[PDB]
């Protein structure tokens, strides 16, 4: 019924492919803007404080136990149901019906589109263009759409949307892709097709201008939502260059001192850590790994980074496990620099309250 088998006789590039591009598609629960659980595009799950509530929420829609992480096309099939309340709500807008229905099925996906994007009164006042459109005087039509806020707002986004429009082609969306494709198969494993190994990742790492080994490269990963250190995949690394909003390395190099910034916001800092162990170790953090990565990204911030690097150098090589590695960060946040504040019953792990201790001498 929902089943996406419905839709076969339609072309492979739709509404939904199209906003998994100008919007992006996350396939786990996360939190939008406004702190809402979401999932797949922009589908809000419910306002509830709880996660768990979300999960329940996505389960009911989904048919199935998700732990809050959905296929594809389960997304695909929850943006199908948001696009029909999209569409009927087009369909009682006096003033997008009338467009709306004069479209062919190509231009009514860059008019969803925009409504996603602006919603229905923004749409709306676009009074000429969309009578342009109505008209068939596609060029001039586009040529007004550009001349907007919308435009200068989202230009990559507006301009596919725009080419959408004038041509009635998915030709923006598929030369996006070509052009990331392209681009990716500069890096791709040539005994994988589907990721970036070892190699690819130097080349990247090179045509960024980056070490490999530097804190630019992990906040790219970070960006890209990379699962692991060890490869790069096919899925990341489009979803990532889509994401930033980047179709080559220009771009993507121009991206990084944003990110960097991004994460001056503590909370987008903790995401940003707590995401390092995750995307370290191999599917706790080996020692040395974790030493390496706390070098990165607790430099500058963690004022105890060389006594722990001492500290952890001396003390018999253990394994670091998820909680802390994350706490952590709190010690480092919260901690005087005589360590005077320390709460010995602040359940730190075992770990840092031994840190606490070996450094005293220093602090003395
Ligand atoms: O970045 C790595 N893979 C990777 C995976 C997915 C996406 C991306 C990218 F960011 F490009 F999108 C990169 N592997 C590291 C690079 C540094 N060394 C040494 C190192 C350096 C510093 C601390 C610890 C280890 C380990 C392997």
């Known amino acids: 019924s929902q089943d996406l088998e419905n839709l076969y006789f339609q072309g492979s590039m739709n509404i939904f492919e199209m906003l998994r591009i100008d919007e992006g598609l996350r396939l786990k629960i996360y939190k939008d803007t406004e702190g809402y659980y979401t999932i797949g595009i922009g589908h809000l799950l419910t306002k509830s404080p709880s996660l768990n509530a979300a999960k329940s929420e996505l389960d009911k829609a989904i048919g199935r136990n998700t732990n809050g992480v959905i296929t594809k096309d389960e997304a695909e099939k929850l943006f199908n149901q948001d696009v029909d309340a999209a569409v009927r709500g087009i369909l009682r807008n006096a003033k997008l019906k009338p467009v709306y229905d004069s479209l062919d099925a190509v231009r009514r996906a860059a008019l969803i589109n925009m409504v996603f994007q602006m919603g229905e009164t923004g749409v709306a006042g676009f009074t000429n263009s969309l009578r342009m459109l109505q008209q068939k005087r596609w060029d001039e039509a586009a040529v007004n759409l550009a001349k907007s806020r919308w435009y200068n707002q989202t230009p990559n986004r507006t ?206």
Request: hydrophobic letters at 40%.
């Open 159 to 364: 301009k596919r949307v725009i080419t959408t429009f004038r041509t009635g082609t998915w030709d923006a969306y598929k030369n996006l892709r070509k052009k990331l494709e392209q681009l990716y198969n500069r890096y791709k494993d040539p005994q994988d097709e589907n990721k970036i190994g070892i190699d690819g990742i130097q080349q990247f790492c090179d045509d960024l201008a980056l070490d490999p080994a530097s804190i630019s490269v992990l906040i790219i990963a970070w960006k890209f939502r990379a699962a692991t250190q060890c490869e790069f995949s096919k899925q990341e690394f489009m979803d990532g260059m889509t994401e930033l909003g980047c179709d080559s390395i220009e771009k993507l190099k121009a991206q990084i001192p944003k990110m960097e910034q991004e994460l001056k916001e503590p909370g987008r800092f903790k995401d940003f850590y707590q995401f390092t162990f995750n995307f370290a170790k191999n599917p706790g953090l080996d020692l040395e790994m974790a030493i390496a990565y706390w070098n990165l990204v607790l430099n500058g911030r963690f004022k105890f980074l060389d006594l722990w690097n001492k500290f952890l150098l001396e003390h018999h090589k253990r394994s670091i496990p998820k909680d802390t590695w994350n706490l952590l960060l709190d010690f480092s946040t919260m901690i005087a620099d005589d360590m005077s504040n320390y709460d010995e019953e602040g359940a730190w792990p075992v770990l840092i309250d031994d840190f606490v201790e070996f450094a005293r001498p220093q602090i003395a």
